[PDB]
Assembly symmetry: D6
Homo-oligomer: 169 residues x 12
């Protein structure tokens, strides 16, 4: 709903993020191996406290339930571009929060970091997310062929993208 | 009258963090409303001896955390300092702005021995530029599209006040 | 069916230490049954980012610590990995061997994208070499007097299984 | 020709590399700023000596004249994919060398590194980069809109790729 | 002239820099104290070698003579702004290289660094400096009152500024 | 010949090593990538100067020419085993120095290092290598199936091994 | 009274010292800015644990109430001289403990460190302290003109002093 | 004369500084021990490169002959006051240079550093130090009793001062 | 009894080991000074966590009572030799556990580290231990004359020894 | 008889600190009665392995902290050591001096194998120089104005005793 | 003869020491591996500069020709005992030097170090090591069975000793 | 003579120091072992460069020849005492430079270092040393019995001492 907010990740939030980072199936559409020790994650978090090339956001409702995660990575201040990554948690999915949350990472990228472009990557075989993004104003700019090994085979992905004005206006 | 002003300590940091992740308060500082505690704590721990800033916490007599005030970029040759100010939204509209701005000019001019104090303020903050004008500040600057805030390029004033006019 | 497989954490380490100081279990790994927690903890803390190994903990649904499984010497050119396995003596003879070996080949072949998996197994372990044979492994090696264990020089098998045959 | 070879980027080759990373003409198509200290080149070079995620190639002829460079970067060892890029030094361009150099690299990635997918990012306003790349076998899979700011203004670039599949049989 | 080119500052140049930072005529016009040991200068360098908020340029002619120093400082990245500062060696002044070297500077920022605003601070009693900024398109936006104490007295400086739009177009 | 002697690897030799580790003909037969900067090589050295699980030998003739490299690696200490590897410089191949240099190697391990087992891995399609190990007393014990990807293709290698007993006696 | 003692400062004592270091008015006659974070103080304390150039003493009664602070700083073992600094706390002042406490810092400087001279600095505009010191045997040796910025203006101070014998005898 | 200039103390000037810090004649009035390693001079020099609390001046003539030094120390930026001291090398004393050197320093402190008060500590048994200092405008504000042990015995020193007030108008 | 086990020393075990390291009389037949701070010991323990040249074992019964300590030191993997050291605690002595425990350090040295020789050192004036060792298969190989200062005078000691087969067979 | 002597540990340090800030006890050691715990703790942590000193704590059977005894400047060539001793004022005049001095000479001569033990004692300590004389020590030194203590320059004795005379 | 002297092992003497620690003939009786980097020799040398537990002696003649070495190791300062060993460089063996060298060492240990017991470990298959050692006064106290693996096979060594007692009176 | 001057010890002098500390004739008379590597010497130096409890003097003649070494050690600061030690190079002995170099030494301590007591320790069987201290005003105050083991035997030394008063006056 409108109650949904975003907030900078925090050390208190690191069990909730670990639990999602070890879920084979949540992690399956992020193209990332489900194996992170709470030691490795914790330490990767600390090493990156001051890395200005990312914003990692924890997603919350009103009753203070952690809904999921929005991430901006690969922020380049020269070309003004960033990669966006969203995970809604197992217990918070199929509830209709996607549109909202995706739209606050643009709101953020665009109304705060003054970015020129946000781009994502999405499995053609997760053809629910691609309609979600479309319906937010993202257009397809590449059919990456056999990019990422997911689940026993090489799987294709769509690079999608929305520009700053487009969102802002 | 009941409003004291004292240095920033450690069990002050969850006050600061809170306000530091608020859009409607940070924008007025132009800053980005993203700072985790780790960042906050660690950046605190690195300036602990930096003699170029005075970070103050505003308290009442009941000792409840009223706001903060900063004297940043203190340059000891030209004796210039900037002044930013924040009242927590929960102590706004109480008539605390004038008192807290004068203690800040009272610390700068009567303790630090400074020559200039300067602030930057959003132009769209029309009931605020007055405040500082009303405290003896005068615009010297119309900054065209200094800060990108809330979707667009925006203008802020550079205002200024000297020891010569606050002490005299 | 009820057996999950997940990365090695910190409040896992008294499980590991225990088994790591057991003769009748370590010998089957050829290793020495001497490792204190300090050694264990500190060596853990030094490979935390080593991307050449995947150390997994076996749990049930009741979440009781069933065993561990390791993918060590992962070489990303030849895509070969070794596979060691341990079930705590208190979950032995329950019929857990096949399930846990297949999840290990399922992690190696379908997540890591590996070409080879290889294990070493005592020759005197005659109801075990079968197990892996029975899981699609085939001896390529009779290692003459590789490991000194339990008083004498002893032989182990080098067995192997490819992504080509586990996926097909 | 056949004289051209690739080898490990060494410490002594950094006054060669600095000079090309400070050239506006070369860099502005590599999409990176034409600015970098020898000190930023060498210290960044020292930080990455052990990084199994890249191979950095100084290209030489038969008389050891420094011709050009070749990177293979972002070397992921799950998906087995990398990014491939190439400069040929202003003094050795337009001599029919690019293909040998693309080939050698794809030979290295595929017959040695064992990668599944070599991909390159190429600008539309560089029509002979696109072309040479097609000749060598690369396929476009993308057209990225105003993805990089380059010389006054936002420009599109293409993505093009070959698989181990395609290169080891032709 | 067309022989003036900008290149990154280098260690082997840091003696030339040293001579301009310990000269009072030039550093007055930089609001900064003309005292800086070769060790401070060089330790400061090493300290800011990876620092993305500045670009420090040496200026060469055709014969590899050393001309001057262009700097872009406080490259802010949200707001896309830098402050521009310059020194033309004493021996090399009043040959009309200024405009071409303020030109090169506006070029970098706006064509490569994709910044919106270039801004400087120019001493009101250094009007030569004032009149070189105005022909390159700078506009006054602040009259900073008693900003710097210099040669025994507190002076005024002008903020002047030029925007990306106005440059290219 | 009797002029071939082993001595510890030295820093001043590490250029000679450098030339064999960046050569593809020789490193194929070492199951290892022919790419290694002088900095990796030399930083790796310093890293393993006190490390008791390897002995790294340079091989000299009478005239102090540099011949080759003998290594003993993974000197395990419970089980008394090492793996033996070798390279004879290209210029120095096929003069029949091999046996004497595999000989010296078996000598060290078994007479000074009191190891029980010497073992190697030899590329099946590098049979010259195979036939040099068998005359020095090595016995095959493994046919490692598709162990190394090399020149575009996954190959087989032989484990071969020789025991302390069989050497001395 | 005679019950008053002195004891080396200690980490347990650091809230009591902080509370005095942030009192504009206690700190006003010490010429020192009232702004020390409990972090800065704590850290300055640690950095100086072994600095033999100071003695920092906490002042206590019988019931274990912390009365104030006596400090010796700038101890020079060549000329034998030190600066003395006393603060009695807000809740312990106007009680007649000054004479006593001042006399145990001499007792200490003189009977223990074997110092030759103790000197202080005192605002002419805190003309209660100057009579206190006089009445302890301190004589005036300079009228420092406009030394220290206190409270909106430059204020004068008396350098005072008592020699070793003078005290000891 | 007018040829004399002050500049930043550099690494190369420390064999000049060592030699004066090891001279009993010079130091014994500066109140400091005539003993210090080059190693103690250079390592202490390295520790203080960034210290905004001091300015250390090598004085030179027109031919860059090393004449003397000048410190301004204890540079407090609330009270805006400092201590000022000066040696003139044994080979360039008694040539009428001291005033230029005091002036230059007071020019630096007042027209650049922006200090409110420059103070010096001078010995009674140095009557031409007291004198030169008066000529330049300094006022005694103190007479410190046996404040320093110097050559066998305890000696008094005076304190003398000028304000920015007095120097910028005369 | 047969219930007796050995286990790698551990940080929890360090009061029990300290208490024995400060017993003049237990430490008297170990030729070692009874003075180790729990700080020195603790720190010596940490420094040696990964030193492969020793095994320090804590001895336990069934009810989890710490019986004493067995130590292997000076393990040399080239000659295969080690020094063995046993202490049974004050409250666990004269109970008949010696034979057992000595025989598990051989069992360990011989069945696990694959050592060739274990040797000890024993005061001729502790002529109970020498019969204990004899009765375990240790033979005397030197009468060290006036080796170790124990209790006011230079005392002689027997170097004793048992070989691997001898034990194993 | 009931008095044991053992090494200095960590939960010993508030004993030591206490005595270390006492004038009437430290003076007899000539030392300065100023040492904070931080100094004490940290200097402890730096000599933990220094094999030139043995710092002992005196306990009774009831295990109450009776005093301390030190063997400092142990030189392993000349085999000389100094010996300082302190009984807490609350265990003084109990007749503990002789027993505790002999255990110290018993540790030095029969464990450390030392040749000399030497102590320095205030001359104005006339019922103490006797004590050590009475334990076999003999003045070799009248140190003129060694130590400044309690307002004035003062003399101390250098006394000495050898392994040759304590063992024989 | 009387020209021979011992002195502190210095940094410059390590290319002399390396060469003897890499000789199979010399080392194989010292019971240590004939293998060690200059880097392992120098870094181990750097780690032990302050170690009061050893004295390491380069032996020289009258013309400073490097003759041989001498260690005294495991220098315990309770029991006052040490291990003593000695090499004489292949080019200066069989010239009647060993005794002087053993003597000098026992002079150092007993008249300077003040040790109670100097002990050496000697191999049976070195009958003139045993012999020379007896001549100098050393007594066997042990015969250690197959204590070291040396040249293909396990060998026994003897232990031999002299006390300060015996050496300071003969 | 009047050409003998003291100056601080310097790194470039530390070879001269090296030659006196490895000479047995001279170090016997210093109660210290004539063995000290150039690395120990030079690492010890660096360690005590800021250390205020010693002054280490080299002694030069007019021609910059290197004469000897004067040291002041254990400069205690409460009690104002140092120990004085000296070496006159062998080549430079018995020319009557001693008194002037013991003189210079007493001069420093008492006129610059404001110490009350100079003390030394002189080997009873080194009476030449004894008779040089007595004419410079030293007085015996201790006969240290069997203090140092030297050339095979434990000797006696004299404490001798001289006071500030007696020097100047």
């Amino acid at each position: 709903n409108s109650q949904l907010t975003l907030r900078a990740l925090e050390r208190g939030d690191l069990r909730f993020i670990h639990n999602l980072n070890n879920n084979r199936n949540i992690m399956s559409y992020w193209f990332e191996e489900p194996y992170e020790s709470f030691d490795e994650l914790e330490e990767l978090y600390n090493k990156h406290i001051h890395d200005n090339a990312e914003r990692r956001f924890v997603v919350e409702d009103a009753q203070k339930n952690l809904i999921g995660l929005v991430e901006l990575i690969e922020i380049n201040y020269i070309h003004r571009s960033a990669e966006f990554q969203i995970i809604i948690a197992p217990e918070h999915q199929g509830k209709g929060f996607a549109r909202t949350l995706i739209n606050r990472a643009l709101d953020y990228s665009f109304t705060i970091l003054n970015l020129h472009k946000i781009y994502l990557h999405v499995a053609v075989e997760n053809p629910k997310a691609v309609h979600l993004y479309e319906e937010c104003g993202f257009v397809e700019e590449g059919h990456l062929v056999e990019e990422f090994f997911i689940n026993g085979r090489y799987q294709d992905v769509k690079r999608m993208y929305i520009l700053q004005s487009k969102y802002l206006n």
